[PDB]
Write a protein that binds this ligand. Structure first.
Ligand SMILES: Cc1ncc(C[n+]2csc(CCOP(=O)(O)O)c2C)c(N)n1
Ligand SMILES: Cc1ncc(C[n+]2csc(CCOP(=O)(O)O)c2C)c(N)n1
Ligand SMILES: Cc1ncc(C[n+]2csc(CCOP(=O)(O)O)c2C)c(N)n1
Ligand SMILES: [Mg+2]
Ligand SMILES: [Mg+2]
Ligand SMILES: [Mg+2]
Ligand SMILES: [Mg+2]
Ligand SMILES: [Mg+2]
Lengths: 504, 501, 502
């Protein structure tokens, strides 16, 4: 007999009877996963046949108790009481929670499927020893649930905090696999940094596995690690303004490394973007072809730059983003959208679920929108975004603001960061997408993501003043800008450049 | 809040959500059936979201309680406790009964689906306030469940051998107005002490375009008490059949020229039509489905069934029903029966299609039908006669006739008069019996007619065996004797002696 | 290197690559069949072919058995194969002989006598052996037909040409095939048996083969649980008396499969002889019926019953070694009837065949010496007791004590026992009579005597009836009566009919 506080939600295995590979049993899989992790187990399915259910539940309760792990049942509350189960899970469309509590009485864990903040409010108006934990929405798409992102999970953890539901644990569920578990753990944190997921739920990743022991050992590895080094550049927090000597080193490195920068964009920017890249002494590639994507990313110092409202299918954007994250190379997200039209908002939010971005760059509107929300406002927004997507965020305007929300790539269960939206580093400065892409692209393993982005914003802003002076209108401004970028970097003398870098 | 003994199983409505006609609601149907009968109601939901289930259950509990009728739930015991239901029904493959009792505690009705005696034994090894009632097997075939009366009797018999006095019974599966009275009529304990406490329907009310009317009809049938299944008298006669009665029978059939439809082999086709001709009535050898209703509509029509025939079960079913609809007599003369695995199968299936006026077999045919010397044969003959609520004939040295119709009486739970004490007397035959019964007027008597037939046949037999030179001439002298014997009604003359058994 | 005369055609395994069960190889199957019996013939890409052929030639040579190839003559020469098989639509035989040169065995698929003629006007060291037609139906690509071919091999004196039977051969019909596939002159039979699916497609090829071996090198086919001994002494009164007693005491169950005219009249004859008739034409019942003591099958023709069920019934009785009597209402009366009847004669072994002058001459594939010759031909052809009804009834015994052998083969058409039964100038009635006499016999009985007993009894009842009757009508019933009276007093010394030798 376990109690609320003895429950370890770390790796939470939810079974599904009609998904087991031939020559393997449900007992067999659940056994393998207990010997290698999963501090919790839930039985469903049916095939019901309510009597065969009960026999399988008892058979499996012995196994779990043997390994000192609780057994949860869904959604048959009666079978739960009948076999002396340790808890029950119910969905939004199952028996109302109060009714359940009345039958099972205190002591028993009650799990609830929750996908929206609105449902966290209800959960809260009910107080403790009603809902004990919740499975957060369906994180990613999946074939396991017969009918039916991290941004969405955050909105829920945030409601658990605004309502101070201290008594309610959380696990994330739906489409969780080794290719996205660290990213999920990493960016699913309360905005105030005080709360994260207490564990991870899998079904197909273990159950449907030809080797369930191995699959589980892998998920365990990911969950009890603490670093997500998502790009082969330094992520150290830097609080000292970026020195002239550092900017100089950045530019040298990218000039010497000749980074390959893959542009995925519409057209207007195709040509102008390739010019900026050429000026910065690196080679542009405008491939939007799925098969090439893994080969491109394999080339030394490769970099991805994303634009939006593009002619490329979501299936390939997903493919590209993943391709770069697999080789730990940097992605820069520069929405041409974003939230400009209903259709763009949709596509952009879908993009932000495909992987981890090294940098997100927007203007005042693009940024406020991303922050889900003047001058003090733009700063708050910039940090919110940076923290939300665990990335370096740039907000362009008269002043350009840069915030570093990577937190050295740190994640943990429940904790969650050690660091809220409010107190991450954010500095100020008084085509940019490709500039930033080239600076980050050139950095070696010992580099620093944040300094590089700042370097880029400085460089760009510097070239701007020069061009606006030497030009005769919009036309020549464009070409004088490219020229300034070229001249500026062929002589590393940042001590010279106009733009002033302050703290925010 | 109801208790075990307040439950009225009379007309028990079991719902099914995805079977309701367009423009009609489950509330709507269940309402109509409460206003006209349904004395009990069960709700299912194997396919929905457990929350919509609970909302519909409460919505419908108010309706039932409003009409002072309990609400039963299946098989979600949890939903049952949660909404304060009055009982739960579970199947053979659902949660074990002891476990259920432990959660819901005494006071709540527990129903169990039961199809075999073996399961009645288990029900009994558990004693009272475990299983309160049972739904007996699937009586007839149906499209309602996703995966006969003889069979129900075997279950009622086990409820008696085990003295499970505490357990009610309802019959279920394929019950409609075309077979409800026959079900109530023949589903009785062998000792006559127990019958079905009620009848269960799903499609007959739920899937109805006019649920109010459909229900009013089922009610009519359930609380009636007579099943006059043939337009002949069914009165119990304890006085031996007098010569004057036999004489009247023969006269009637000669004057009525009954049309006797033979469904038979090919050996019996010809020989059977001869006997029919001799008795002054016309044979027809139609095995065609479309003709069957027209044939039966002809005055004094009669059906004679043989087995191991080339005719499809679908048409036998069609014929048997055709005659029962017009309340005309069927005689069942198995050429099988239980002679081969295939025959046993077909015959038992036949006995589920309708009500027979008479069943005729030899020592083996009969013992088999009784599901079991010279005393043994007598016990067997009554068993059969009572089982199929019919007049049963067992041919041999002595021919035994038993009358198990019990004046066509049925009731709920009661149910009666046991196997042991129905009337039984002692003394080609299929066709003879068919013609005697065929000729009887509304005021006649089924039992006397059958006896008359057996007498007549046995009489013609002695005469023929004497006037013949072997098997060949015996056959034709028998037909002749049948002809001569009936053209002069003088039963005072005939050889065969009629005693009590 | 083998030569013509070292070739043992006993159990001849023909492979088929795409028919092997999972987890089993062609090497695996052919190995199992060599260790338990087995000559061998092999039938994708021409290069994989050659590799498999060599691989398998080593195996065969290891067990001292030749390897034959079909129909790639080139692959044959290339791998030094021991012989080649070709079909009727493959390379002409002379051409083949020219390329492979003498010494190599040449097999030819043959299904008609016409093709035996061609095989013959080519003389020796052209065609060495032949696979006879397709005996029974099969998904891989009758005995009366095989006989016509063995007969042509004899009329042409093709002494140099062996024969194997092929197509649909399995344990349920191998002995019957060996048993009735013999030259009309009795001098020639099949030199062996060919299987594909029975061994190749088997989950246990070792066992399957051991079984086929058992059957082939046995020599008795006891196809009915009655004596088959050749009796040359006329059937004595005391024997007829014993027969009738036995059937009266045994009350045989006689299953009639017949028209509708004969249904009733046939059941009466059966009843009179103190046995029970059953008129079932239902497939599922058939195995249960035959399992009942002293059960007997009587077949009529142009019936409403499907060939699929007749096959089912005939087999059902042969499996329990009970007697079948074949009394064609056809036969050869119409094109459709001939067809169905011949198909029936391929379904199993009959204990007796009964026809009239036409029915019989037809069956013999052809007066009074003529009728006698015909009757023996039929009796011998279908290895059965044959009855030919007329003024004289002729009975011939072609069972030859149920003896079979490879190549040998037996005793010709000409010299099996044949007797006659006359009484003076006077149908489906005799069929039922015969069915009841045979039905009653115990293991120690004798098939031949019983049939004769039946014919005598019937003929006897006939004279009596023709005298006591007033026309066709009463004749029928007086006949049943006479059958009844005659058997209730076993006094054959009394009966009119005279039994002579033919
Ligand atoms: C703890 C908890 N939270 C939520 C639910 C509902 N739920 C969300 S998606 C899905 C399966 C995805 O598996 P996968 O994609 O790993 O194959 C299910 C069963 C539940 N039953 N338990
Ligand atoms: C009291 C009780 N006994 C048995 C069962 C199981 N059951 C067997 S047959 C049938 C469908 C017949 O519909 P129809 O009358 O339209 O043929 C169902 C529901 C149950 N659920 N409740
Ligand atoms: C020696 C010889 N004779 C004939 C043929 C032609 N042939 C007639 S039937 C048959 C397949 C029978 O398989 P199963 O016994 O499984 O029915 C084949 C292959 C030949 N290729 N070789
Ligand atoms: Mg169930
Ligand atoms: Mg933009
Ligand atoms: Mg549900
Ligand atoms: Mg009978
Ligand atoms: Mg004939």
């Amino acid at each position: 007999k376990f109690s609320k506080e003895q429950f370890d939600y770390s790796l939470y295995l939810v079974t599904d009877s009609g998904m087991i590979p031939e020559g393997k049993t449900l007992y067999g899989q659940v056994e393998a996963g207990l010997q290698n992790g999963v501090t919790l187990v839930q039985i469903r399915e049916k095939d019901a046949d309510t009597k065969f259910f009960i026999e399988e539940a008892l058979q499996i309760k012995e196994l779990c108790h043997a390994h000192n792990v609780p057994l949860i049942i869904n959604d048959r509350i009666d079978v739960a009481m009948a076999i002396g189960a340790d808890g029950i899970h119910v969905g939004q469309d199952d028996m109302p929670i109060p009714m359940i509590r009345k039958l099972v009485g205190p002591d028993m864990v009650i799990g609830w499927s929750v996908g929206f903040p609105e449902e966290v409010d209800e959960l809260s108006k009910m107080g403790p020893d009603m809902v004990d934990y919740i499975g957060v929405g369906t994180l990613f798409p999946t074939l396991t649930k017969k009918n039916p992102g991290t941004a969405g999970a955050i909105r829920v953890l945030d409601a658990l905090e605004r309502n101070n539901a201290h008594w309610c644990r959380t696990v994330g569920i739906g489409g969780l696999h080794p290719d996205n578990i660290e990213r999920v753990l990493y960016q699913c944190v309360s905005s105030n940094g005080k709360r994260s997921l207490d564990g991870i739920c899998v079904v197909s990743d273990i159950i449907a596995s030809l080797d369930a022991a191995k699959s589980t050992k892998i998920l365990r590895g990911l969950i009890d690690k603490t670093d997500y080094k998502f790009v082969n550049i330094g992520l150290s927090t830097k609080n000292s303004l970026t020195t002239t000597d550092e900017i100089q080193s950045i530019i040298s490195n990218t000039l010497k490394a000749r980074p390959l920068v893959q542009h995925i964009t519409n057209k207007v920017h195709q040509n102008f973007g390739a010019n900026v890249t050429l000026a910065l002494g690196s080679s542009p590639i405008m491939s939007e072809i799925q098969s090439e994507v893994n080969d491109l990313a394999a080339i030394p110092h490769a970099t991805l730059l994303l634009n939006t409202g593009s002619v490329a299918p979501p299936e390939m954007l997903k493919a590209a983003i993943r391709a770069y994250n697999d080789v730990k190379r940097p992605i820069v997200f520069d929405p041409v959208g974003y939230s400009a039209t209903e259709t763009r908002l949709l596509l952009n939010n879908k993009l932000l679920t495909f992987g981890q971005f090294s940098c997100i760059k927007g203007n005042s509107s693009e940024i406020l929108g991303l922050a889900e929300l003047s001058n003090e406002l733009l700063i708050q927004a910039t940090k919110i975004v940076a923290f939300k997507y665990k990335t370096v965020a740039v907000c362009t305007g008269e002043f350009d603001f840069i915030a570093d929300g990577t937190i050295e790539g740190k994640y943990s269960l429940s904790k969650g960061t050690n660091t809220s939206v409010e107190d991450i580093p954010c500095v100020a400065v008084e085509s940019l997408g490709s500039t930033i892409a080239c600076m980050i692209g050139g950095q070696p393993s010992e580099g620093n993501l944040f300094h590089a982005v700042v370097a880029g914003v400085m460089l760009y802003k510097a070239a701007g003043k020069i061009a606006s002076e030497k030009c005769n209108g919009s036309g020549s401004f464009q070409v004088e800008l490219i020229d300034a970028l070229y001249r500026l970097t062929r002589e590393n003398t940042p001590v010279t450049w106009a733009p002033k870098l302050t703290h925010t």
